[PDB]
């Protein structure tokens, strides 16, 4: 019930009364752990941006990382590093463009690598987590390029060097399954498996087509790399699941997040990061609300929780705020993270009861993306 500012006033007054000395210095963040969460603020397309590093258990900002124009954040699942792909210009938002990847130490937040990406190759888009992706060994970062045509850049994080671009078909997003392989989603309704080397045409194999041309699959699917589970909602809350854990795509039965009566009464998912997935519990969380069909990027005030195997609904939480984005911590008794772009506030909820526990406000100008590590 005592706030963090009140606790600190008490502590500082006791040190003053006791005559305690301490040296002003640069703090280290606490060690990365399951309840650390990162919030990125694309700032409604501003030329510079910010990421907030947060202790979810305390509801406290423990660090920040500056970024350039629409950067893509990634967080190693084991907690060993974080990194982003970013873009800057010689005079704020014009002149010469430099695209680069920086890797950071997760406790000092100092850059430990700054790697230039030649010929300005990043795709500049409102932030989609799976447009830049670590392989599961953490040694390689893969990023999407849209112009002049779809391609995938390969960055060697261990050797701190850009490696190559790969040409790909008309496909989007990058879900890595092995040191040398990832999947993309194709315009034709298939996934493409891409297996690449340092040089040479990559081996690209399409899966079966798995959805019709008029089912629209959102820009923010959840992907659990450690489970190889791709959880892909459509505009109506139908959920496609793809099991990539064998190294090939296996199509799981589709589930409906909303009932037929709810859909008839206008319930649809909506927001930005509309879906989360908890690996250990095998559970799916989806941001939903009553809305017109083309209001699919507006906030939502409800989260439905369902069993990924059977599709059975476990809960429907009333969030009590306008929520654009959700994610969960990957530990036992996980937290449900609920970010409001409009309130610039992260609301931290108990993922089992749905109760709001605490919140962190003043998170930049238009915070949109929540990332956690799967450390377990």
């Amino acid at each position: 019930q005592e706030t963090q500012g009140q606790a600190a006033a008490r502590a500082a007054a006791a040190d003053l009364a006791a005559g305690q000395d301490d040296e002003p210095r640069i703090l280290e963040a606490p060690a990365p752990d399951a309840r650390r969460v990162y919030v990125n603020d694309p700032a409604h397309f501003a030329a510079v941006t910010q990421q907030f590093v947060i202790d979810g258990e305390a509801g406290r900002v423990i660090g920040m990382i500056d970024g350039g124009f629409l950067p893509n954040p990634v967080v190693a699942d084991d907690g060993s590093f974080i990194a982003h792909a970013s873009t800057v210009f010689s005079r704020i938002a014009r002149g010469e463009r430099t695209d680069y990847v920086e890797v950071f130490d997760p406790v000092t937040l100092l850059p430990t690598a700054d790697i230039e990406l030649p010929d300005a190759p990043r795709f500049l888009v409102g932030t989609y987590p799976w447009m830049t992706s670590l392989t599961p060994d953490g040694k390689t970062l893969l990023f999407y390029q849209f112009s002049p045509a779809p391609a995938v850049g390969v960055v060697d994080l261990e050797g701190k060097a850009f490696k190559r671009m790969l040409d790909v078909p008309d496909c989007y997003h990058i879900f890595p399954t092995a040191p040398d392989t990832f999947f993309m989603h194709c315009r034709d309704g298939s996934l493409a498996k891409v297996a690449f080397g340092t040089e040479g045409t990559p081996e690209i194999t399409h899966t079966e087509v798995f959805h019709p041309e008029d089912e629209f699959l959102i820009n923010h699917p959840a992907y659990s790399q450690k489970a190889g589970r791709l959880v892909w909602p459509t505009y109506t809350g139908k959920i496609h699941q793809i099991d990539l854990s064998s190294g090939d795509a296996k199509f799981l039965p589709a589930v409906e997040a909303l009932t037929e009566a709810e859909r008839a009464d206008g319930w649809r998912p909506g927001g930005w990061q509309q879906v989360a997935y908890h690996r250990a519990l095998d559970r799916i969380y989806l941001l939903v609300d009553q809305r017109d069909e083309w209001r699919h990027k507006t906030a939502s005030r409800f989260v439905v929780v369902l069993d990924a195997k059977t599709g059975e609904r476990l809960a429907k939480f009333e969030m009590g705020h306008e929520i654009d984005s959700i994610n969960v911590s990957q530990d036992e008794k996980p937290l449900l993270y609920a970010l409001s772009t409009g309130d610039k506030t992260l609301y931290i909820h108990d993922a089992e009861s749905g109760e709001e526990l605490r919140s962190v406000n003043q998170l930049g100008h238009g915070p949109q993306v929540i990332t956690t590590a799967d450390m377990g």
Binding site: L124, F216, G270, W294
Partner: protein, 124 residues
Amino acid sequence: TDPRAKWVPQDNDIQACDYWRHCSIDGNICDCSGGSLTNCPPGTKLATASWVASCYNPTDGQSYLIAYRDCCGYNVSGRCPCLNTEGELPVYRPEFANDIIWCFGAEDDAMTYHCTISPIVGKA
């Protein structure tokens, strides 16, 4: 004002988010930073690529194809922000996708987003 309500176009004020041609705009209206409905502000660069939507015009009952264009090479204007997504499709149907910074082709390789213009290019 209910953000989840069906969007209702008007043809009486171009600086408002419900103006009919802004049915799939994502960003800022150029008219509010020194441009006009279909011209970029001074100092920016006009992209040659576009994004399309079919926008109903309540003035004449007709739907028109709006081929939006970004004005680029400046930090985001911050004035008259709007985000509408009528007909808007995911990134794998990019001709209708509006989170992409469509600054491709702008002079001087300009790729930062300032604002968007809303010119008509045809009927639906």
